[PDB]
Amino acid sequence: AKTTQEKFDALKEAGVFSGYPGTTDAKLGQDMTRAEFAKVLVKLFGLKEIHGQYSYKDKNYDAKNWAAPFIEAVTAEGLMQGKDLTKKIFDFNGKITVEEASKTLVTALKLEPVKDAQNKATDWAKGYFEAAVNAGLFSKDANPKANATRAQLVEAAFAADEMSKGSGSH
């Protein structure tokens, strides 16, 4: 048995999770930006950062945005595509939701989204969330449309790491 705090400490020592911005603290009750979670995914699945490329037209998405190399990496990997393919908006300052997190992890772990899933997720995420719940990445009782707490994300990331180790191709 490991606590959420212990799982954070482990992932932090591994360079996967950082403290809540402005702190080095777990702050398990707080939310996380899509920018921060992009970095988490890059560190968790050992993706290569992509510098000098910008695939999004978000305000202040440029060379001066620390998150750009991570957002570009998850985009190239096919984990995240942003919220609007017309306007090319990632929403890097937006909070990562349980169902958004579910998609990234289900895609990274190569799990099959469940066809004709019945749950409270947004239509696009129904299969991704169902697959995430079935794999034990999130609880059945998690709100897919809710901002994921750092606790939920720590538990999800740790579970995804264990699944990667166990698969034979970490």
Ligand X SMILES: CO[C@@H]1O[C@@H]2CO[C@](C)(C(=O)O)O[C@H]2[C@H](O[C@@H]2O[C@H](CO)[C@@H](O[C@@H]3O[C@@H]4CO[C@](C)(C(=O)O)O[C@H]4[C@H](O)[C@@H]3NC(C)=O)[C@H](O)[C@H]2NC(C)=O)[C@@H]1NC(C)=O
Q: Write the binding mask 38 to 77 for ligand X: x where contact by CB under 6 A, - elsewhere.
A: ----------------------------------------
Taking CB under 6 A as the rule, does residue 85 contact ligand X? Answer: yes
Count of positions on this chain that bind ligand X (CB under 6 A): 10
Q: Are 71 and 38 in contact (CB under 8 A)?
A: yes
Which residue, 120 or 165, has its beta carbon nearer to ligand X? 120
Question: Torsion angle, CA of 135/136/142/145, rounded to 10 degrees?
Answer: -30
CA distance 26 to 8: 7
Q: Are 130 and 119 in contact (CB under 8 A)?
A: yes
Greatest Cα pair distance, the chain, in angstroms, is: 46
Judged by CB under 6 A, the stretch of 3-11, 39-47, 79-87, 160-168 that binds ligand X is 79-87
Footprint of ligand X on this chain (CB under 6 A)?
80-83, 85, 100, 103-104, 122, 124
